[PDB]
Design a binder for this molecule. Structure first.
Ligand code: SB2
Length: 332
């Protein structure tokens, strides 16, 4: 058990091992710091109010559980996990530690003008991660350009993968729809890609209903085929109210962009989550011909998420977590 300094950063206080030095605020709370033990730069995240509510406490175990599982180049994982306390009784803090990344993808579309080859590498990467994630039966639900960490290199990893702007949500999340599927991430990836290629937000909706309008001026109103599946004597309904729309040509909507890419968008941005192309499929798409390599798009171990499915007490969750903290084996 390592020696910990203590120091205060802004209002938040910080209690970490000496192997990390230079703690430096990037944004619970994140600091950039130097890992003497490996001499690589890292991100230390101090979880906010870990075991406040049951809703926090479970959320804590979830985050630790996921991060412990994520072993994949395109997906944030755990270098170190640590608590200052010793024995169960003191335990009320959790700092998570990963490879520092230092820019997110929203400060890229706001810097650069990006090449087609850029979106290529970048989107491939997103789908590389996605696909490992989906293979564990986890669904992101919030992919958006601020959950994608990119380092100076143009390397990218997926942040917050399975913890949870309306702009990147599949329509089926904006219609609640309590029980959908993994292709919701695909919709987002479309929204991200479109914007990477064009420099403007695809669907900058002002609220939840404006957004289903914006989506519709593009992908068009649903065929009686899809309409039937909307669970409503009237939640339905509510769509057909709003005028009937031409499905626009992605080709013009997206003039100038590589037509491989545009064909790819036509398949991600499909109103019907059954006809939405999967992660593993979209990587076999020509757009990624440069990068693709079947024998290098790895799946994940199966992920145990029955825990999700049950009501424990604060005391029961903080205990399980602590089990997770001390049971932690670091990588290579
Ligand atoms: C969705 S909100 O925009 C949001 C922003 C940042 C983060 C966010 N969480 C982390 C973070 C840090 C350490 C971990 F172990 C896990 C995640 C980072 C991070 C990781 C590596 N290098 C720089 C920053 N960014 C999570 C949510």
């Amino acid at each position: 058990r390592p020696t910990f300094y203590r120091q205060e950063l802004n209002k938040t206080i910080w209690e970490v091992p000496e192997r990390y030095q230079n703690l430096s605020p990037v944004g619970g709370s994140v600091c950039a710091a130097f890992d003497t033990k490996t001499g690589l730069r890292v991100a230390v995240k101090k979880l906010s109010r870990p075991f406040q509510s049951i809703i926090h406490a479970k959320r804590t175990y979830r985050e630790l559980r996921l991060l412990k599982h994520m072993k994949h180049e395109n997906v944030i994982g755990l270098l170190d996990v640590f608590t200052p306390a010793r024995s169960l009784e003191e335990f009320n803090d959790v700092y998570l530690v990963t490879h520092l990344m230092g820019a997110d993808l929203n400060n890229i579309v706001k810097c650069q003008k990006l090449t087609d080859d850029h979106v290529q590498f970048l989107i491939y990467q997103i789908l590389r991660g996605l696909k490992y994630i989906h293979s564990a039966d986890i669904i992101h639900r919030d992919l958006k350009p601020s959950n994608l960490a990119v380092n100076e290199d143009c390397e990218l990893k997926i942040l917050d993968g399975g913890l949870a702007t309306r702009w990147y949500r599949a329509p089926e999340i904006m219609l609640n729809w309590m029980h959908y599927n993994q292709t919701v991430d695909i919709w987002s990836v479309g929204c991200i890609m479109a914007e990477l290629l064009t420099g403007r937000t695809l669907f900058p909706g002002t609220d939840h209903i404006d957004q289903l309008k914006l989506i519709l001026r593009l992908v068009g109103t649903p065929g009686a085929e899809l309409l039937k599946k909307i669970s409503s004597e009237s939640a339905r309904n509510y769509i057909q109210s709003l005028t009937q729309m031409p499905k626009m040509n992605f080709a013009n909507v997206f003039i100038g962009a590589n037509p491989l890419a545009v064909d790819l968008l036509e398949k991600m941005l499909v109103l019907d989550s059954d006809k939405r192309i999967t992660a593993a499929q979209a990587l076999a798409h020509a757009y990624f011909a440069q990068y693709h390599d079947p024998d290098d798009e790895p799946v994940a171990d199966p992920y145990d998420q029955s825990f999700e499915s049950r009501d424990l007490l604060i005391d029961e969750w903080k205990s399980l977590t602590y089990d997770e903290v001390i049971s932690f084996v670091p990588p290579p």
